[PDB]
Design a protein around this ligand. Sequence first.
Ligand SMILES: COC(=O)[C@H](Cc1ccccc1)OP(=O)([O-])[C@@H]1Cc2ccc3cccc(c3c2)CC(=O)N[C@@H](C(C)C)C(=O)N1
Ligand SMILES: COC(=O)[C@H](Cc1ccccc1)OP(=O)([O-])[C@@H]1Cc2ccc3cccc(c3c2)CC(=O)N[C@@H](C(C)C)C(=O)N1
Ligand SMILES: *[C@H]1O[C@H](CO)[C@@H](O)[C@H](O)[C@@H]1O
Ligand SMILES: *[C@H]1O[C@H](CO)[C@@H](O)[C@H](O)[C@@H]1O
Ligand SMILES: *[C@H]1O[C@H](CO)[C@@H](O)[C@H](O)[C@@H]1O
Ligand SMILES: *[C@H]1O[C@H](CO)[C@@H](O)[C@H](O)[C@@H]1O
Lengths: 323, 323
Amino acid sequence: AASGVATNTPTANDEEYITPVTIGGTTLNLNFDTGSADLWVFSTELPASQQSGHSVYNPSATGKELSGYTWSISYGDGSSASGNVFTDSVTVGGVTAHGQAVQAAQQISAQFQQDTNNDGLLGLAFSSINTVQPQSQTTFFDTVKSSLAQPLFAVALKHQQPGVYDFGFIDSSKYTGSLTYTGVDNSQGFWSFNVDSYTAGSQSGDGFSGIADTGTTLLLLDDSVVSQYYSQVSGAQQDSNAGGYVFDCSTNLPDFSVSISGYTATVPGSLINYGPSGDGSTCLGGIQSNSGIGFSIFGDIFLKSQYVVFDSDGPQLGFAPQA
Amino acid sequence: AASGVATNTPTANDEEYITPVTIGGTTLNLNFDTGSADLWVFSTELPASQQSGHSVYNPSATGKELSGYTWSISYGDGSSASGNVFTDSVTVGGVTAHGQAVQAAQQISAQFQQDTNNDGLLGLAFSSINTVQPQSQTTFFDTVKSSLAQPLFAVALKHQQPGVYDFGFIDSSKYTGSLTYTGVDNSQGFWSFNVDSYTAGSQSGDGFSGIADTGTTLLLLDDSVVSQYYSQVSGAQQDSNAGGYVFDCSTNLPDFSVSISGYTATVPGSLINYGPSGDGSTCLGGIQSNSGIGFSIFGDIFLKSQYVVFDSDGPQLGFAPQA
Ligand SMILES: COC(=O)[C@H](Cc1ccccc1)OP(=O)([O-])[C@@H]1Cc2ccc3cccc(c3c2)CC(=O)N[C@@H](C(C)C)C(=O)N1
Ligand SMILES: COC(=O)[C@H](Cc1ccccc1)OP(=O)([O-])[C@@H]1Cc2ccc3cccc(c3c2)CC(=O)N[C@@H](C(C)C)C(=O)N1
Ligand SMILES: *[C@H]1O[C@H](CO)[C@@H](O)[C@H](O)[C@@H]1O
Ligand SMILES: *[C@H]1O[C@H](CO)[C@@H](O)[C@H](O)[C@@H]1O
Ligand SMILES: *[C@H]1O[C@H](CO)[C@@H](O)[C@H](O)[C@@H]1O
Ligand SMILES: *[C@H]1O[C@H](CO)[C@@H](O)[C@H](O)[C@@H]1O
């Protein structure tokens, strides 16, 4: 049975986490994203000037073209990318997917043309939301899952330290105590789960649903919860230059917790300070608005406090505090 | 119980079929497409110069905006469109969907900027492939289906004559004999079905699968079947100016048939002559290549010969020769 461990590393301010992935013998640094289902990479099909500063996939050398197939994806921040499709070998943490669909970029929006930290994204949401047309393809995890020792992957993202993505097995040394599981609703293709309640500092509130999403940097919540939280932070103020609420870097931030099937997942206040706002000398808060979409995004700020198991059997999510 | 009849009308050469749809009190001419699941329309959000020659939806007057939601779609021919989303009333053939998601265009590719024949497309494929993010929306048919007398719609497209889309009931006067049903595989979101064999003129062959697709003008088949068919047409030749095989307009074209669950669906040769090629004085053939995608597209050329029932119970497709 297969299993493997891929090491991830945060970029500045933990804005994103990269992990090396070898495709057709070329290694590229990808952003693993449990919030989408496409594996796409910068390629030789892009104009030369856009290839600069990136490791790029050359489909002609090793890939098998799927004639007539295309892909196009748009993310929550408005960025987008599109291209054609080839099958090729893809290795992550020593685990190899033969015949994995690789989406070669032909066009990318400005956000991507600016970020030299990654060479593409590897989707780990459910395959039902893969964008390939006319027939969608399976994510790397769905392609290999029947070969793994257990059909699951687990993640430990950390603050300014290397972390891991465990494929096919659980590393019990990565968390304290036992894991608590909760059911997943995959109807919209996400790893969605319910929380029974929350506690933002000195105020508690009713439950809501949200998605476990490694691809999103912040913890995005309802406007009402955001207001409740920052009402407790002395001097907090919105600053559109920074992208949301900011406050003096020395501020004592309250914790934020959610109850999930009897388990209390706590994000300590220190993790909620995302870092310098890059506008004056204030810091940006890890908690910000979800723009009214109706559900919460449990991004990197939250994930840094927990070891999370994504189990296809159920499906279900397991949580415990990182050790 | 509800039911209704919407009248469709072909544009020049039956290139596409339009049907009026009222949205928030404004009537727009849309292309009904069983091959996709998005209802999108030209809107006031487009630059003014792109609105010219179209009836356009004004979301500010009557729609409820879904904050943070967006859509982006790319079709087989490479054309694309994207925008935001509002809910509003949508009426088709006297049947009204309250709260239907309407995708307002913000950007459209050149193909759309050129076609003044339609103001958008109304998708009738399965909702699982609707492109709205972060959570997909239901097609007009899925929105109203529980209210219809029977959860199905049926279509009769015709050559240079008005046709119909029956919602919620079957008009037995539209076909000869009884309907023959076959099972549908909706796993990729299409109305996909299997044929046991085919007969192209004097040559027969093994079966394959394909999709019933009102949105595609031609009958797109495997390259091998296309070659077999045109080998029988005297003088047939490929002409990239016309887009495929062309031949003298006076030519006698052989019939094309497929066997579906014991029923023989026959497309008479006269329907296979699509019309003038718009290159010299040859005519373009109704049968052309599917570019190697692995399944066939039963487009308008095929549908003109049959009355087709799209039944959500099963799901299943029913066929009989048009009367
Ligand atoms: C296609 O679905 C995604 O975009 C899914 C789910 C979704 C969909 C629509 C709206 C909101 C959320 O997010 P994701 O794949 O994790 C997606 C991954 C992603 C892709 C491009 C990015 C470019 C710049 C910065 C970020 C990016 C993140 C940081 C960031 O957190 N961005 C968020 C927005 C929300 C602040 C974001 O777009 N994240
Ligand atoms: C998003 O899925 C569609 O495009 C589905 C299925 C599909 C997907 C990918 C590849 C092939 C087929 O096709 P459709 O919705 O019926 C889609 C509807 C559509 C949309 C825009 C068009 C613009 C110009 C001309 C046509 C258009 C047809 C005539 C035409 O037959 N075009 C074909 C290509 C195939 C000749 C077409 O794009 N048709
Ligand atoms: C992950 O688990 C597999 C299967 O037990 C091992 O073979 C591998 O070395 C790693 O421990
Ligand atoms: C990735 O790399 C780290 C150290 O660089 C290891 O701890 C991990 O097991 C994986 O090999
Ligand atoms: C379609 O069917 C409905 C339900 O029987 C009728 O009410 C309607 O007039 C049309 O015949
Ligand atoms: C649409 O219009 C035609 C005639 O224009 C009718 O036959 C059809 O029933 C529907 O009303």
